[PDB]
Structure 1
Amino acid sequence: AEPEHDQRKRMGLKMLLISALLTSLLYYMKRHKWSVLKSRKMAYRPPK
């Protein structure tokens, strides 16, 4: 019914490993850029 069975699963393995690795990396990168905003502080200073 599906000769690809083994190869398909062997790929799934690779897919997860890379996936987990790539995701983590891009999470750090995403956070790294955003940090500039995430910590940003503001104040309202009218000549009041």
Structure 2
Amino acid sequence: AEPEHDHRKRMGLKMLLMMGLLLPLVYAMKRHKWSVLKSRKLAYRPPK
């Protein structure tokens, strides 16, 4: 019923390893770009 069984499990292992690499690096790129905005400071100085 499922001749692709073994090949699909080998692919699943490679997919898990690649995702375990790629997810934190892309998250780090996101945080890198957004850090410009996340730490910005605002001040209001009206003429009295």
The answer to whether the superposition gives a TM-score over 0.5 is yes
Match for residue 35 of structure 1?
35
- CA offset at residue 24 of structure 1? 0.7
Unaligned ranges ≥5, structure 2 = none
1:17: how far off? 0.8
Deviations 1:10-48 (A, max 9, x none): 000110111111111100000000000111111111111
Runs of 4+ in 1 over 3 A off after TM superposition: none
Residue ranges of structure 1 left out of the alignment (5+ in a row): none
**1: CA distance between counterparts of 2:7 and 2:21?**
21
CA distance in 2, matches of 1:43, 1:17: 46
TM-score (norm 2): 0.92
Give the Cα separation in 2 of the matches to 1:37 and 1:9: 42
What is the percent sequence identity of the aligned residues?
A: 81
Cα RMSD over matched residues?
A: 0.7
2:6 alignment partner in structure 1: 6
